């Protein structure tokens with residue numbers, strides 16, 4: 148679990164969005180596993196606007212942060228799950244690091260701010276949904 152709170156927006160994994168997120172929907176994209184909802188309170192986070200390929204993510208299944216080198220956002224095949232059919236997930240960045248399904252929502256940050264959130268993983272892999280291209284989150 149986990150979310151990004153920026154301005155009057157809450158960014159979550161689309162597959163973990165609540166009834167309240169959907170009732171206050173701003174934007175969602177199944178191909179990216181992202182959903183953004185509106186909030187009444189002002190958010191605590193700031194978004195990176197950069198091309199960093201290293202950063203640190205929070206891993207809830209270890210209660211720890213880990214450094215990572217990750218690939219640029221791209222279209223990657225993701226196997227079927229309870230939440231989605233087998234499909235290509237876009238704007239996804241992969242890295243070597245520990246993850247379990249419940250780690251979705253953990254934030255990946257570089258020195259410039261929030262880069263994205265955990266969205267996929269595998270045997271010693273962790274994948275992050277990028278949010279740096281969503282320029283409208285800042286206004």
Ligand SMILES: COc1ccccc1CC(=O)N1CCCC[C@H](C(N)=O)C1
Pocket residue numbers: 162180225228229230231236246247248249250251265266267268269270
């Ligand atoms: C962090 O997730 C994992 C980590 C280790 C192993 C497996 C997973 C689970 C995973 O990658 N899934 C299935 C559940 C959620 C939806 C994801 C998606 N974005 O399509 C894909």
Ligand SMILES: [Zn+2]
Pocket residue numbers: 195196197198199257258259260
């Ligand atoms: Zn950066």
